[PDB]
Amino acid sequence: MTEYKLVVVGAGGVGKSALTIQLIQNHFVDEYDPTIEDSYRKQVVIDGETCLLDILDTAGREEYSAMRDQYMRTGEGFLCVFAINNTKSFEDIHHYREQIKRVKDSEDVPMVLVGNKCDLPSRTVDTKQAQDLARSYGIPFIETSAKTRQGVDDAFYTLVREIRKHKE
Template sequence: MREYKVVVLGSGGVGKSALTVQFVTGTFIEKYDPTIEDFYRKEIEVDSSPSVLEILDTAGTEQFASMRDLYIKNGQGFILVYSLVNQQSFQVAVFNSDKIRPIICEIYTSRIGYL
């Protein structure tokens, strides 16, 4: 069974955990409980083949920012979450996107080099 690693990134309090839990379990969490790091697994179908999503729900606080690069390096897919009513959370999403882009480009460049 294929496994895909997905990393959920964003500022604290924007709803990363709520979106992740809603997707994995179908239930919505209304109470805010700051996350340090949570892993979820969900079986899905990709191209008619059973697969597993390993979803890493990351901390949104600045004190765990040093771990962000490690999360990005290990991820295969990324979900950037921000709040429509919080401009700073959008700026964090742009920052995270800018951090992801060079790492992803490096991975694809090295893979293309082996073709």
């Protein structure tokens, strides 16, 4: 059974944990609980193959910018998350994307751009802007809501397919 080491990165409060827990436990927490370090394992079927997802939820607080480099190295695929509500967190995806590429010494890095908090009505980031940023990186883009579970499966399923394709 193939294991897949996934890492969820992004600004604090964009929904990395809400997304992951919606994946692992089918529940939705609407509370504030800034993460420091959280690792999850769960089995998932993808294109017929049962595989093992090992997900690391990272801290978006910049108070933890030092443990970042080490976990980015071991990780095989990355979910770069931003909230459609926060423009800063959208522009900061670049900061995270360059930080990952330094430790992986390549640009064929398995990555998926994720737009969370799609339920809310105050959408400051347009689909087209995000598709443009994804085409700019040559990676997929996927809109999600941890509240309603929209595209939560799709986001992780697509990261795994990126790993398999890059694995060749």
